[model samples]
Target chain A: DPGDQICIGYHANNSTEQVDTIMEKNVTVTHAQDILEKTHNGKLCNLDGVKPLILRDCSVAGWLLGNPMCDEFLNVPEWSYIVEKINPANDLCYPGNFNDYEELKHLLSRINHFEKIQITPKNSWSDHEASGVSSACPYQGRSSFFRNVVWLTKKDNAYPTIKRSYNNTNQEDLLVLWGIHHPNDATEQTRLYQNPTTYISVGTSTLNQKLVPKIATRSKVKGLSGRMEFFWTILKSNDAINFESNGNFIAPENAYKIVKKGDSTIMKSELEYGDCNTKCQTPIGAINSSMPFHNIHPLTIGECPKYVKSNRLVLATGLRNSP
Target chain B: DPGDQICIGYHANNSTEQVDTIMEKNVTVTHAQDILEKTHNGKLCNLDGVKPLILRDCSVAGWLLGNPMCDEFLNVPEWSYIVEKINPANDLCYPGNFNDYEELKHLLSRINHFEKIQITPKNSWSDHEASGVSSACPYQGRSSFFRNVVWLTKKDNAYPTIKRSYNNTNQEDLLVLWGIHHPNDATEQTRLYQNPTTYISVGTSTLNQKLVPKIATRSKVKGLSGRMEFFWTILKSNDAINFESNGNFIAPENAYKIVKKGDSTIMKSELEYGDCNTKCQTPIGAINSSMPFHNIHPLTIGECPKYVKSNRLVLATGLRNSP
Candidate 1:
């Protein structure tokens, strides 16, 4: 008993002479708490709960086991039995016994994941939840002391787009006309009050590459009548197109493929783009066309005003038949 | 002779053994150049000017002063007597002698004030002439080593004015017509052509302070004939006017002075001249009259439109006898 340590709960800072008891040995915290709460309340009944006289049984109420008055509570009614046992290490809360009020006071001092987690970055979403529900009544472990792994991302994508919808014409109607009728034939049959710029019939399935053409307010190509020829002019122009993937627009060059059906030639380009991860699938077959009476036709790659120029007919009749 | 220093024109840098004549004391360079040119040419004829034998009499032609061979012309006809001497200090033209060829070669090396003066800034224009035309075959003084004083000026001024000239009215005709007329009389007569926003005439002297008004494109106050009453409006309305001393616009609190006139206490501004530094001089007495239902009467300063609100008896009779 002389070499024993005591945790007096609220009065743990006080000299041990005021109260005493170590949990003997091998005692579960739950069993210890129940025994102390019932016995301590009786003596503490007259005082406010905050400043109650707490006395708990030591030695498992020796009277019940035939030891008689061996309960640490019996010493309390004896008055001077509360001898001050001062220790060198004052703030240590360990080996909480039945009579120790400090253990109860410090019970609430327990740190929960909420408090500990908040001062740190979560490695994943799941970690965030675990740290969410509780905060620390921590005895140690501040945020700076721990390594926190975090997840962050940056967005630097151009928002370019290819037109998808149509006005005045439904998806079904435009589909049948472009798919069923001939270009020259459809030009006259579909001719009525002159529809606004129409999207020349393009195979939706053929658009395997996500090429987002240059973006403008309407997000579509404009100008030129709603005729089949209008759509053919776009390809010859070598307009720059973009692609979208992972919520970001891909830059030119990396966004499209270029194939030529022209005369043999050596070509040079001023700029090129690199492949990045992402895509926007839009067909640009209409852009490969040639005009009538013009001999110099150039195959333009990317977006440029002055495209490839030739002395021979290039985009002429060939574009008329390109799928 | 061993202690003497000789300046040989052609071979100054050469050893003293040939073409030597050392001046015991001081010999003017001019005397030296002339003596050498006459005597040195005879021996120098056999040598090419660029490179050849060069020799000259050391002491007034000691060899041929009286010798029958005194005919120095024999340098070309028969075998020549010209000689070439070589020396160590090759490029140095110093120690020029009566026959030193370095004199002519080093002439340009002389740094003239013309050469020296150009590379520097002069406090006055006259200094430039003295330094004109020559560079020290610029011996030493260079601009980088000297301080050049410069003259620089900064200008920051505002020029804003109201236009006083009119197309239809001649200066003289408008002068007397507006001058002899009263403010109300001029406003009505000049009312035709709606003389767009004419300036109110004001005293050429009442304006005493050089209060600068706000600067703008138009030069003068326009609107209302050049009437004295129009001048008071500028002060009350807080128009920006600039002053001459420093380009700053005078604020309202400092621009005008208000004075009382008769029993009703009309106001007259302190500004008198319209153009002379600070003034309001103009012939706007002509602008006060009305076109439709109005009698010719000038409204004196004070509480304005409200000043003549009684209607029937406005400035009608009051200005009729104003003179």
Candidate 2:
């Protein structure tokens, strides 16, 4: 019956391990409405003995607590459900397996009034679905909504106070998911895990700061693969920033600046995947130490696993956390 | 008997009218040699009655004095004959008609030992022929020799002192013969006689002086035609100059500067002859007051009458008067 009980995960500030606690599923419909209202307002009044846990601390069991019988469906609005389940940092959650459509369908059905809204398995999620249901648990890695929300969380952190002060002021947010390839020969395989330093600065500012949601190298992940993945977010205003270097070692002169507006801002590599296959160890492999790093090819929605083996840079507009 | 005598034209500084005096041709070959020596040395010792005359003072009748019989063949070296007959300014003398090859042959024969040298009628003359035989009386208008000699006259006036001070120093001489077309209709026909002002300034100099051998307007000629001809020379060192304007009226902003070295310095016109035939009076003809003048097409040897109808600029290296 413990598996059937709806649970929430929590941990005290001093503790490393998360504790899974059950939510009282036997409450009346009126009591459930009161619990949902308190959760939505960021007040934990209905759950007397529970403490707040950041979303990333939750285990897989806590993520699946309301499944199967759907008894935990609190009959609240869809927006209220999103606010209660996900925070700005731990915005995207992969349910069951990343590509498991049936698990995602069952999760969507558990949302109070959303069950009657017909859902279908798609290559990617829409912006509406991304900001709502998938903001908590994204069904696919290539979801534009998923990528956008990821960017939004970082943008909120980067420019917390800036607003549209003038009518002409434009705000732009970009999420870049860069995948770098590993050397096929063992002699240069270490390049896959080498951390690339990136410097981003606005045209108006002298300080060149590290990009927010900094470039994630292969060493940060648990399993070592032939391809390494890195992710960063860029939040800019009417002005543009100079993104210098995606190299294993940063050199000031080697930095390529992207200054043009709109789609031209995405920089591409002169060499594509599979372009350097023969004698890869001699020319390109040895170049890892002193040579400028290649840019990642930009990946659009629905193009994840398809371009995962090749180096790529995925882009998406960020979604605001609040309506 | 007077026609059999060789005659030279002369005038005093106060008189404009030229006097043709007969040279004593009946003297013995020994006495003739003395006269020749005096003439070659720029002295007039043998002739007592006549004063010196600039070559231009010589009428068409004086030019023909040594003609049919070839008695004026003074057995002197060819270089001496050139110095006696042509002054620096009156460098070229058109004999008989511009294309009269027979008259040119007779003129070449008068150069003592050069009489035995074979001469042929061709479309153009070589540099040797240009600097030697054709320097005085060119048979054809397209003679490179004639063009070079003309440039030499102008260059001697412009840079009388500057020499190749450094081994790397380069000297360039250019002659531009621009022919502008007249309007087909009567409305804008006055553009043909409108003088175009040009300014020439070296890159190192602040002064923008008028180009030497200033632009010639159609009104300067005795009889006006449908086409007008303008001629000027550019003599420069390794450094280049800015040549501004070929327009009816000079405007500082509308001036075109040519800074490239060698042949690239010649600017070309966008419109060719016959390109703007219809409504010519409306667009091009009326534009004389405000429009930028068209550049002349550069003419090489053997291409004069061929491109005479179209606007053209003829170029040649200047030949030095002395060996």
Candidate 3:
């Protein structure tokens, strides 16, 4: 209704059923018959990892990334995986998510044995071209990512460069949290929640880092105390508040920098272990290993001072208690 | 002329250039701007390097790779170098020699590196995409030539796969010239005798090998003796040829492989020895140390019963004559 005869647009925001533009526009037409022309599937055009909707390449006769699939929807499809795709272009390659194209190129610049291509920011398609994508475009020629994608006619050619919506958040949210009030709220209150309709992955490459300040970063493991994260929770007390240290951790309050920003639902668990986001009753792991300070702070409210509850304030202020 | 619209078809017997298409279609329009961008200049398009036709967002600036003349062209009176308008398309560029799009892509594919674009013999359009020509499409994203070239697309974005060209044969032409006549005669004659202006190049991204057959190879200053190349012209009665080797390479007889390709080319030369290419008249300096071997035939063409005037046929066996 807005523009063309084709009513093309995704209605599902995060649903597994929604097909990405890359697939719907290109794959369905160019590659609908066969797959497996390449060795590996690099990456595909969906935001989530699961819930795939791989189209086909009719001419080459293959599915997305040129992989073989049993179903049209790719129930148990095979994908091509080559190591060269991960390597740099005629230039060079670096592991992990790179700082940016030129940044990675410069880092991977050779010194002696082999001649090297100098990485300069001059060749950037966009501002982020240098710092955004690794100069290595690892997923560029991937089998899983490209074999099925095709553009017919001059109009359907390039992958349009879209303007990225930037998040300009201050670290003010990391100070305090309010528990299930927000956690259950954010995830629609499911005790065990994850991306249900689609596949969710979490190993950097834009894995969000939430600094919700809740949960007294505690540990029950004997030798592995306080070696993971720092969590300090403040609660209102009635009588003599019960504080447990059970020879578990010796918090170095002096070096510990904690803030309260009303974000308990997004506590230590969500911020720390996201992959296996599965809930465990066992004691939470250590927050950090940088020499812990054994100081105690009295727990109070959002500001960390409970005048009515003395123990509440003392619980929050676990000052650097020297051994 | 039936319909009377200039036409071009593909039936010429050529690996690259084809004038046969012109004879296929009759034309009415002669030299007026056709607005639809159908102009073909018969000038020679340089095949040695990458020639870029500058295309802005939706405008055509001109065809340019690194032309420094674009600035000065504007100051001249009707300079061909100036950006010209392709009628309705405003100002776009057309190659001076006007090769079809396929030929253009083939030539460009021989050099550039792009993300998500493959330019094969069958799909030259992919090469255009790989060259960052938006009008083109992409193939695979990653490259193996470098360490890594990772494209950091949006978290919701699909993987960008780059298309790569399938190479059939090494486009290198082997030059194994013999100079029984004269060095100048061989080189110059070889130049003039080149085929119908095919895409021959100099200093291409092609890993070309320069070979100076060891049997007849020698040093510049140490003329007349050690491993000398010779002229077939008979001097005096002895039928002696002007040989360049150890004092008097004119001597007629001895089989040898004189020197191995080594770092000798890198050896410091005397002040008078400017560039080995120019100073070293002997075949010694012409040989690339990194050259892969085919085989050595003999000492002279006389050694071969079927020896005509092939460039690569080395003289290794029968004739013991040393030049």
Candidate 4:
């Protein structure tokens, strides 16, 4: 092991020896946390089933944020409020091994956003999940940062906050339906009632591209529904429309078809049981309407608004049937 | 006068010979711009009109983009941009007398954001315009030693954007708005539009904040927006409302108050302009509210609905209700 490069890596200036593997890594990331601890150290703990000691043979037990887990690191305090957990234990390590904890601690402390950092030993990193069931344990950073962010944890943003029965396996991105809806709609349609203006900048990157629309809020500021509305919008928008293969709406040419992206035929199968909505989908990814105003007729998809204007009277490319 | 400095009478890298007249020791410098025999230099043109010739007398211009004229320079294209003209003609220097076409050609070839650097004698130095315009330029130094900054235009966010015609400027801040307005006092009289969201954000930052809410349009990764609406809601919410000075009915306390800089207590105002539906003292900044909600209710600022949630709101805090 002497010539094996102890793997004691250094993230620019931070030294690896400073971090405790059991605390900052998969063993026991943080002490039992509240909002404050969660924001600073990203409360990592045991999931519904399993313990850190038996992580290798057992599934890595933990909840980065709101996972169904119990506390194990009672003596642990989250890393410094300023330090962010970049190379968190990815799937390969959440029930991690003690390979590169010390080195990763130092490097992560040095970076704000960790993208390419591969903990070759464990092979994982932190991310701002965009969709359901989870959120990050990030710090407020600064007043300006807080000011630009919105936290949509309100009722109108999906009264009762509908939680999905099942879980997902994808990265998240921030969502925003800042505030461009009516109070009644947001309240009754619950799903539509959610405002994303005040939503935090976090969530599913995949669903985000298609779900987000022009954002607005009640406050006179340019954007921010409540922070909650935007959050709900993105949360709901993140799920792929349980369609068969909507992304393949248009059949690709022989050469381009090999790309395996959008396939009109496949996408038709992917079309959700309902109509085209913010995050419409195909087998490959999210999809848009095949015909422009094609889905605006009934507004079937969740809480989307009806089309106000369109090229009506024809089924061709951009034509629509006037209301 | 073969001085040690490249700019004959100025310091080593101090171009834009602002203190050249002082170097001439109070000699009334004439407008020698007419004596130039050569012309048209792109490097010397961004200043609009600066050529190496008989020193000239041009109009005293105001700062662009508001803040003290951003008395700085941008390194555009092949060279760096500096404060070519700080005060009047004396603020920066020009090649005093281009006796021949060859000298004029040399001066033109080298003139840049730091044209004054080329004019002053080498090694001889002079001070810059202290507070002529309080704007912060993006660079420093001059000549072959210029630093890399302010080369291209950047958004100056340090200053507030919302401008007020009244003294309540200090009362300027992003105001949040939440809640619903019952149309005609009843649901039957007014179609109960069920809108789930009700919140928005609007800042009092100066005019520049006007067109800045759209992030992707600016640069998909850099431009950011403040969730003004959530803050507006907080401003109105029962829990954190009173935290702001005069929280009930007071507005911001810094927009245009005579607070003498450090003074903090000038009283705040409320987000409500229910009575000021439509009216204006100034002929220009007038308002004509046709209904209760006719006031400039934080007009939609900008929305980049490319993420999961398709809604975005960027309200205007510029126009205010009459005093």
lDDT of 1 by residue, A150-267 (tens): 2111112221122322121211111011011111122332232122122222323233342111111110012211111001001212222122222111111100011212211112
Query: Against the hidden true structure, what lDDT does model 2 obtain?
Result: 0.22
Winner on TM-score (1 vs 4): 4
Candidate 2 local lDDT, A30-67, one digit each (tens): 11111010001112111112111212333222232221
Q: All models, DockQ values?
A: 0.00, 0.00, 0.00, 0.01
Instruction: Give per-residue lDDT, candidate 4, residue B16.
Output: 22
Clash numbers, per candidate? 95, 2, 145, 166
Error of 1 at B189 (Å): 47
- Rate residue A204 of model 1 by lDDT: 35
lDDT of 3 by residue, B17-61 (tens): 111122352222212221111111212121122222222221212
Model 1 residue runs over 4 Å out of place are A1-323, B1-305, B309-311, B314-323
lDDT of 1 by residue, B17-117 (tens): 21223543222121121111101111111111122112222111211111122223212222111121232121111111222233322321221111011
Clashing pairs in 2: A297-A313, B130-B145
- Per-residue lDDT of A175-291 in model 3, one digit per residue for the tens? 111011112132321222221121111111112112221223334333222121222221111101111111111111111011221111111111112222111111122111121
Question: Where does the lowest 10-residue lDDT sum fall in candidate 2 chain B?
Answer: B30-39
Please write out the lDDT profile of model 4 over residues B1-323, one tens digit for every residue: 87575544421322221212322432222221211111111121111122211111211111111112223322122221112222233211111111132332233333332211111122221221111111122123422111110111102211121122211212322122111111111221112212221211233333111111111110011111101110121121121222111001112221111111120111111111121212111111123222222222221111111112212222322222221
lDDT of 4 by residue, A75-145 (tens): 22222112112232322211112223344333323322211111111111011111111122112331111
Q: Global lDDT for candidate 3?
A: 0.19
Q: All candidates' lDDT scores? A: 0.19, 0.22, 0.19, 0.20
Which docking category, incorrect, acceptable, medium or high, applies to candidate 4?
incorrect
Give the best candidate by lDDT.
2
